[PDB]
């Protein structure tokens, strides 16, 4: 849907992100730029152009590039909300 949930088996993620509140760029959120071929992210259905919305409940819809990078890097069971537009 316009917004979806992806259950990554956290335990490397095989994905690349671009954007942020200060470095907002085109694929004003933090957007998925690349996804490795065999990476966990690709197996889990995460698509290029998806704007990451939240990481295990922590919203990134308006978060610094590094703030989002740290969110995806410390989810502590993992769930990522995305915006497919």
């Amino acid at each position: 849907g316009s917004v979806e949930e992806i259950r990554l088996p956290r335990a490397p993620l095989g994905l690349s992100i671009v954007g942020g509140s200060d470095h907002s760029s085109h694929p004003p959120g933090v957007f998925i730029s690349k996804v490795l071929p065999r990476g966990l992210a690709a197996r889990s259905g995460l698509r290029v152009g998806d704007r990451i919305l939240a990481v295990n409940g922590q919203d990134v819809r308006d978060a610094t590039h590094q703030e989002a990078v740290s969110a995806l890097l410390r989810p502590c069971e993992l769930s990522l909300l995305v915006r497919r537009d």
């Binding site: 992100i17 671009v18 760029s25 690349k34 590039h65 990078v69």
Partner: peptide, 10 residues
């Protein structure tokens, strides 16, 4: 868009 396109692979 703006400039300084930063990308981070996780």
């Amino acid at each position: 868009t703006s400039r300084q396109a930063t990308e981070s692979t996780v």
